[PDB]
Ligand binder design. Structure first.
Ligand SMILES: Nc1ncnc2c1ncn2[C@@H]1O[C@H](COP(=O)(O)OP(=O)(O)O)[C@@H](O)[C@H]1O
Ligand SMILES: Nc1ncnc2c1ncn2[C@@H]1O[C@H](COP(=O)(O)OP(=O)(O)O)[C@@H](O)[C@H]1O
Ligand SMILES: [Mg+2]
Ligand SMILES: [Mg+2]
Ligand SMILES: [Mg+2]
Lengths: 371, 720, 148, 361, 372
């Protein structure tokens, strides 16, 4: 073998596989679990820590942690455990054979790339690697040279505007709010019905409520009126122990935090204003071309009704004659991956990867010259 | 003997300790090829016979050869099976300790022929040859009966013995062969209920189904197709062209008759073999308490007729574990895993017991009719042992792991005895033990067998530990507990370079025969032998005469849990070792020179594997010790005294001082030789070959003096 | 040096030498020197004979006189090869050390090795080595017969 | 030799034997009789019970009487197992939330009276998982002196979700000694507790619906059963056969405030985190002698099905060998190859005194 | 009185009640309803079917004791009505329709708790005007501060609410269902190590009285564990109601340490020091400094000796060292929420913020989600 690896490490789930695949081979939570409790059955062969679907299976005995928070790697020992598990347990390949494409968010600390680069060359010994900005990959998963991408993952939401292959880096806008902050708001508003979720193992239950039940209100003050005056919007979820939750306005007060970050206590404007102020910060005669081309990606763009509310809201800010389109592909949870497999199969980018030779010549500051 | 060393360029060295580059395996295999081309199939490593199969009726076993090797010391003659035969007989007549001969090799390497021909030397030359010939025929006519029940087809050969066969001949104080004994050790009883791909079960089942009267099978499960039975078909290999099962059955059925089984005892024995088939076809299902129950009645309809037990009792025994406490007896039900293990433990136990009973029935037919009890003068046994060789396949498993641990333990014993046998002579002759370094078998037996950290004690725990348990969880515990060991490796412990050769779900042992890689899949299923007291208590109640003798009432007293197959194998192996430490073993090691079964073809790519599996290079390392050669000063001086003027024709005094002047004329440097209490030692064979090459030129002068004396005498005879 | 010939020994040697002279020329053939020495009970090797003949063959003629025959006689009389050396030499060709050699093994070494018996001389040796006709020679007895 | 001893001293019976066995060798009542020899122990005392004051040294899993508990260990090793304890490491059992002095003085007496080479103390409901072949489940151990619940998941205990109830078989004997006096049968002496325990062990069963068995017994004699006493007087019993085992479901019959064994089990499962509960509802293990009544796993399934949500599957694991399951699990544990690293040695006891058990066990 | 405001801090372990304008509450009683266990036999006695407060707790031996409130949630509304009835009729001795009543609640509560408190207060007690405060906002009214972060620690709830310059910050509000009852149920478990088997709902109140008198917070927990493991001088004797003298040792500072290590009780949540810092570093653009300068401690589990010095030490190890971490622990901090509600309901400006009986006729129990 010689095919490239790709690793879309992003905040919530790891995604990994080979360039030229359709879809990731590994898709698992970016968690490390460590035992919370007194080990008592001798001879069990209990491990010191559990990663991904092992930790997501054994939740009740583990304190779960994610090393990535807001797209920034906060714990390198846990992140090296996630990368070792990715190569060795999920893909079952030696990293020393394969050039590796990593992904990350715009406006991240420069330390995060340097330490990724150092671990890929000094701990996993890859022959060559690269870092690519996630919303660029999501643009080029779409088969487009021009567009603005909203890329709400688990921990960060960014808009990147790209015109005929050129990013406009002054019109990049980043918001440190996404699906993990929505799970933490849903924990807050679920306590109003009387349900209590407090452990990290319960945060993963509330995340699963949110992915199955929540949806985006095409007019929040009208769904608020319909939920305050009927049982027509309420749905139920069966917990692991068979208790039955029921929720109504909690289904759309959570997703509405994307449009009103003041619910979570932030001053910054919603994803619709953040998008529009990225389009209006661009040059006057490339705006018409970005309004026609709002790609969306990452899982926090997956709610029923979110493309419709986003299309309603940018149409409310834009000139009356503009043809707004929002490109929400069915697979948009994997567009950063699909982009990474394509923009690593290309013959023209095989000269763009950082080689271990160039790392030995310059140390970990090599990524800022290259990427 | 040195007379052959002049021909060492075509005829090779006779004993490999004389091969000069003794650490070169390529020279060892070259000296084997050199001899085998010359039809010299026998060579020593000190006392150990190395033999290579001629695939020809060489005339060397005839009566004129036996009396050539009778009463002659084994290094004063060329190597032969009869030089081992005579030496083993003389040690019995003279030390009056018991003697053994390990016949060793690959399957097909000629082990049968060595055993048949040793039992010819002890028949055709001993002082009661009529009883000796009868004991030979009773020892050898047992072969179809033991071969049907204890050989199976493997990936490597069609007819491989899966047990350590033993055969004594019993001798009185007069050296008359009085009778015999048979025993059988370390049978691969896992093969009754699980076979690897391309391998059959023991030969009797396919013999029974392929060859048999319709009225003989009609009393049993009568469907002729061997695929009908779960215990015959796991290996997918049932039909094969090389094994005429119909003819093999007609020979074996007559061998049972001629061995003195009465017809009803064969009908009992066929009914045990068919009961083992039907035990495989029992299907359990779980009722709503997750407890196992027999679903299919047609197996039990015959198992009551054939095992001779009550059907309601066999249903209960296959599905409940009986415990006895405070005098109450408690039937705890089995789950589907435990009920499958109970059915397969009963098949392994019914079969390994009818086989142990065939060996008792035969052994009791070899024993003496005389009382053999005090004040009877003495009795001594001379035995042949024939246990399976080291075993490396494409996919090694729990059977190979046991076979290779057995061979590791027998190699350990053998190299300890060889090292002891050299060191006792270095101490006796007063030579310093110049310390050889050799592969230390202790470390790899401690890895397998050590009480609470060996692989077997970890595997015994994985069958006993609570919760869901897997072959991969076993491996993950080996990887944690064995971890830093030098002879152990896995895909996790392997460096990135070696990790290409080794899969996940495998571990690797470095054995004396090199590395062997074991797939863990099936280790837990094969190590479980859950024969509960409830199953033995059922079987001891049988109407079938064999099963009644096989499951005695006294065994039911034992309050221990059922021991695992690796633990039973460890215990039985250490009992085979103490039998061989107490007894005096000779060794014969057999090489198969090609896999085509062909005359004259010597295939070094195959022979390198056997020479490695037989450990011949490690034995040569230890036997060679510090010195290639040693000989008594009397024997060394009477040979070479013609080289040094002072010693010729007769030396002036004590032979040690005659050698001490002779080796000074030959100019041996102080490190090339040593002068022990009654032997000269020579360090390198260089010195010896040069001395026999000095004697070979000296023969010209010796013959000249004889001819001059004759030509002088000739005139005084012919005239006046 | 070691010994000097007595007039009676010179007379016995001259009397035997007269059978090889016969016609009265007083001279013996260069190879026939061995035959007169062997008639006189000496055990010379062909190599010893040739190594002495090299000092007297130098003018051709093919024969040697009585004084130089008497000199070459006196040279070999220093060291005639004795019974115990001859017996122990046979003991090196005995394969068992048992004290007997087969007619075939003797026929082998006597034709193969230095100074070689011809097949006629081997049959003449075997004719009285195989004393009672069983096919074996007792070399220990044969040497005491041969060296008398 | 050098195999381990395994010894479940619990409250009513000593169960003892070696780690290799299927089931225990010594099974005798945890009794010392004194004259009413200067004392008699176990089956000897239970046979001579007319002339004796029978005292049990364990009450509610606590050793209350160390001099008589030394006699029971002396009779265990030297008369019943018939071994010198100096040759064998010893696995003792204990109840979960016991006093710390009970472990300290067990440990001191094994090292300084029996000279044992190495020892360990294990929780009874933890051991009773090994005999069940499981590493996930909630275990209701219920002996003579203590009923307790230990929840375990993937072999980790939840020590905050442990529940203990100081009410088991002896409180049921002593309640059958109360409710049988309503038929004019008098049982007062310590020897008469054994006769009434032998009644409880033969005639009692757990009603599936108590208030319907009450009405059934009031209607007709079909629930009445008979027991010949050792002097040939005959006791007939009826309503009293299921009143006694009901005191596990209704600790109010005996004047305690605690919830029944069904609610004490549910209240452990509710102290466990949401993810674990579905696996605990499928793995309710039962062990020890007061779980032996006819109908008790059926009542426990019926009572927990009414507390647990209707989409959960409730299963109760009640093996026929329930009584010996604590000891059987001790036999498995003391056999494990991994466990041999975990014995307290006398060499560590010389460094750390009796306090070492709180660090190791 | 005309219409002096009732202030009823119906806390999870104690009902604290009085009138606004008094320094401190008139009624302070255990929040318990008790019903008899054993059947009555003395036929001449006027035996009640239920007892409340002091009537239940002076009789605890013969009663099974139940709280209506668990973790600030009213779990049993009938035992609740019986306790408010007891408060108005027996303890304060006034008709509730004649007095406007301030109630208190913990933050992040179930919304059916405010609605049912409201519904009962109109449709049963007929109160003329009612409002449902948040307890941590009342401990600032009590402290005479517009700015602070309040650690309020009751019988059933611990919570942190940051208020800066009169504005609460509802994203930064932390709640921890761990307080004086969890510490009491864990002292019942600690005391088993010396064999004291407290098990009844009556003996829960004996173990509570030990916790109120001998328990304290270690300034350094591993240093006190090493001190108690090597000396007798930390031990204290306690005399149980019948005359048995218990002894308590490390058991007395290991109980309060569960506020700093909730993992002792088997919880995954962080200690009260981390829950304070994790709320200050959830605050907005300007304010983080002035909350470190005003850590206000409130409610009965903030009464332990050594808790202020421990909180000051533990936050000083998390917070940037240029900051002044200053912790406000007034002696009255057990009544601080009631004193706070007595200031609020006395305020001339508050008097428009009451829900009035008329407003509950114009809109249903949801009115408290609009008015508070
Ligand atoms: N068949 C039975 N039916 C009911 N109770 C039983 C039965 N067998 C034993 N018991 C009761 O079980 C208790 C003993 O249980 P056991 O597991 O041995 O507890 P322990 O170890 O504390 O002695 C005694 O109170 C005894 O009377
Ligand atoms: N001096 C004290 N020391 C320790 N704990 C105390 C002290 N005083 C009260 N407590 C505990 O505080 C709790 C009562 O606090 P309180 O604020 O009145 O509770 P709540 O408002 O929830 O009803 C009880 O658990 C009580 O035992
Ligand atoms: Mg991700
Ligand atoms: Mg007991
Ligand atoms: Mg309060």
């Amino acid at each position: 073998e010689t095919t490239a690896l790709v690793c879309d490490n992003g905040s919530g789930l790891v995604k990994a596989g080979f360039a030229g695949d359709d879809a990731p081979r590994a898709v698992f939570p970016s968690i490390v679990g460590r035992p919370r409790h007194q080990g008592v059955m001798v001879g069990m062969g209990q491990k010191d820590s559990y990663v991904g679907d092992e930790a997501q299976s054994k939740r009740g005995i583990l304190t779960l942690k994610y090393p990535i928070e807001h797209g920034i790697i906060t714990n390198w020992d846990d992140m090296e455990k996630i990368w070792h598990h990715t190569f060795y347990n999920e893909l079952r390949v030696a990293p020393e054979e394969h050039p590796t494409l990593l992904t990350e968010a715009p406006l991240n600390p420069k330390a995060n790339r340097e330490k990724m680069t150092q671990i890929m060359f000094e701990t996993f010994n890859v022959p060559a690697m690269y870092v690519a900005i996630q919303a660029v990959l999501s643009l080029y998963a779409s088969g487009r040279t021009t567009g603005i991408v909203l890329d709400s993952g688990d921990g960060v939401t960014h808009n990147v505007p790209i015109y005929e292959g050129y990013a406009l880096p002054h019109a990049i806008m980043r918001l440190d709010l996404a699906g993990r902050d929505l799970t933490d708001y849903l924990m807050k508003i679920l306590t109003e019905r009387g349900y209590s979720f407090v452990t990290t193992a319960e945060r993963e239950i509330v995340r699963d409520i949110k992915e199955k039940l929540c949806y985006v209100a095409l007019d929040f003050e009208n769904e608020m009126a319909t939920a305050a005056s009927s049982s027509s919007l309420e749905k139920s979820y069966e917990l692991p122990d068979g208790q039955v939750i029921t929720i109504g306005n909690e289904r759309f007060r959570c997703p509405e935090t994307l449009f009103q970050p003041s619910f979570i206590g932030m001053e910054s404007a919603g994803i619709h204003e953040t998008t529009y102020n990225s389009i209006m910060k661009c040059d006057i005669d490339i705006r018409k071309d970005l309004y026609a081309n709002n790609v969306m990606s990452g899982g926090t763009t997956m709610y029923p009704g979110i493309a419709d509310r986003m299309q309603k809201e940018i149409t409310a800010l834009a000139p009356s004659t503009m043809k707004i389109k929002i490109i929400a592909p069915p697979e948009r949870k994997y567009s950063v991956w699909i982009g990474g497999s394509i923009l690593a199969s290309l013959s023209t980018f095989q000269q763009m990867w950082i080689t271990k030779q160039e790392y030995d010549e310059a140390g970990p500051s090599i990524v800022h010259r290259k990427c | 003997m040195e007379s052959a060393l002049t021909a060492r360029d075509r005829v090779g060295v006779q004993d490999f300790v004389l091969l000069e580059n003794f650490t070169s395996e390529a020279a060892f295999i070259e000296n084997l090829r050199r001899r085998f081309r010359e039809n010299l199939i026998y060579t020593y490593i000190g006392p150990v016979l190395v033999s290579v199969n001629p695939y020809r009726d060489l005339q060397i076993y005839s009566r004129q050869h036996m009396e050539r090797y009778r009463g002659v010391s084994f290094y004063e003659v060329p190597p032969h099976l009869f030089a081992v035969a005579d030496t083993v007989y003389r040690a019995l007549r003279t030390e009056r300790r018991d003697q053994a001969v390990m016949i060793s090799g690959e399957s097909g390497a000629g082990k049968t022929e060595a055993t048949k021909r040793l039992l010819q030397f002890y028949a055709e030359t001993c002082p009661a040859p009529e009883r000796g010939g009868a004991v030979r025929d009773r020892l050898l006519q047992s072969n179809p009966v033991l071969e049907a029940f204890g050989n199976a087809k493997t990936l490597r050969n069609d007819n491989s013995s899966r047990f350590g066969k033993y055969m004594d001949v019993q001798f009185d104080f007069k050296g008359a062969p009085v009778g015999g004994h048979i025993l059988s050790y370390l049978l691969e009883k896992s093969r009754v209920v699980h076979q690897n791909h391309g391998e059959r079960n023991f030969h009797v089942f396919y013999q029974l189904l392929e060859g048999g009267e319709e009225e003989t099978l009609r009393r049993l499960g009568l469907e002729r197709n061997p695929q009908s039975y779960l215990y015959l078909v796991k290996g997918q290999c049932a039909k094969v062209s090389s094994i005429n099962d119909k003819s093999d059955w007609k020979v074996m059925r007559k061998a049972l008759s001629v061995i003195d089984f009465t017809e009803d005892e064969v009908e009992d024995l066929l009914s045990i073999v068919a009961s083992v088939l039907h035990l495989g076809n029992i299907h359990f299902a779980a009722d709503e308490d997750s407890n196992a129950q027999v679903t299919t009645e047609n197996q039990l309809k015959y198992l009551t007729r054939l095992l001779g037990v009550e059907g309601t009792t066999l249903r209960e025994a296959l599905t409940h574990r009986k415990i006895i406490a405070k005098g109450e007896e408690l039937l705890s039900p089995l789950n589907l895993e435990q009920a499958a293990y109970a059915r397969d433990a009963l098949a392994k136990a019914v079969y390994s017991r009818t086989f142990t009973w065939l060996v008792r029935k035969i052994n009791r037919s070899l024993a003496s009719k005389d009382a053999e009890s005090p004040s009877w003068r003495s009795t001594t046994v001379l035995g042949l042992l024939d246990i399976y060789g080291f075993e490396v396949f494409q996919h090694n498993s729990f059977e190979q792991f046991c076979i290779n641990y057995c061979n590791e333990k027998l190699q350990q014993l053998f190299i300890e005895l060889t090292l002891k046998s050299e060191q006792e002579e270095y101490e006796a002759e007063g030579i310093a033990w110049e310390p050889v370094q050799y592969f230390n078998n202790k470390i790899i037996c401690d890895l397998v067998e050590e009480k609470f950290k060996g692989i077997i004690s970890i595997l015994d725990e994985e069958c006993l530990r609570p919760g869901e348990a897997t072959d991969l969880t076993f491996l993950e515990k080996l990887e944690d507990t064995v971890k830093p060991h030098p002879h152990f490796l896995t895909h996790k412990l392997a460096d990135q370079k070696t990790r290409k050769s080794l899969d996940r779900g495998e571990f690797r042992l470095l054995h004396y025969a090199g590395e062997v890689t074991y797939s863990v899949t099936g280790f837990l299923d094969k190590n479980n032998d859950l024969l509960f007291r409830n199953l033995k208590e059922t079987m001891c109640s049988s109407m079938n005469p064999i099963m009644a003798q096989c499951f005695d009432k006294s065994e039911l007293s034992d309050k221990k849990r059922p021991e695992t197959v690796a633990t039973q194998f460890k215990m039985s192996l250490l009992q085979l070792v103490e039998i061989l430490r107490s007894k005096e073993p000779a060794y014969i090691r057999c090489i198969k020179p090609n896999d085509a079964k062909q005359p004259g073809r010597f295939d070094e790519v195959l022979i390198r594997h056997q020479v490695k599996y037989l450990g011949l290079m490690e034995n040569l390392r230890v036997r060679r010790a510090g010195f290639a050669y040693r000989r008594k000063y009397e024997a060394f001086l009477q040979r070479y005294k013609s080289l040094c003027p002072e010693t010729w024709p007769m030396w002036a005094g004590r032979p040690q001082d005659g050698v001490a002047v002779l080796v000074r004329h030959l100019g041996y440097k102080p490190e090339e030789y040593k002068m022990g209490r009654t032997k000269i030692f020579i360090r390198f064979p260089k010195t010896l070959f040069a001395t026999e090459d000095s004697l070979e030129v000296r023969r010209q002068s010796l013959a000249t003096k004889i001819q001059a004396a004759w030509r002088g005498f000739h005139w005084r005879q012919k005239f006046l | 040096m070691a010994d000097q010939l007595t007039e009676e020994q010179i007379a016995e040697f001259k009397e035997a030498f007269s059978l090889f002279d016969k016609d009265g020329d007083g001279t013996i053939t260069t190879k026939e020197l061995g035959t007169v020495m062997r008639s006189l009970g000496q055990n010379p090797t062909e190599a010893e004979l040739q190594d002495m003949i090299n000092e007297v063959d130098a003018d051709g003629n093919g024969t040697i006189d009585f004084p130089e025959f008497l000199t070459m006689m006196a040279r070999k009389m220093k060291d005639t090869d004795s019974e115990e050396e001859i017996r122990e030499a046979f003991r090196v060709f005995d394969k068992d050390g048992n004290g007997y050699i087969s007619a075939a093994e003797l026929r082998h070494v006597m034709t193969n090795l230095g100074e070689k018996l011809t097949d006629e001389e081997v049959d003449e040796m075997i004719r009285e080595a195989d004393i009672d006709g069983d096919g074996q020679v007792n070399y220990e007895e044969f040497v005491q017969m041969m060296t008398a």
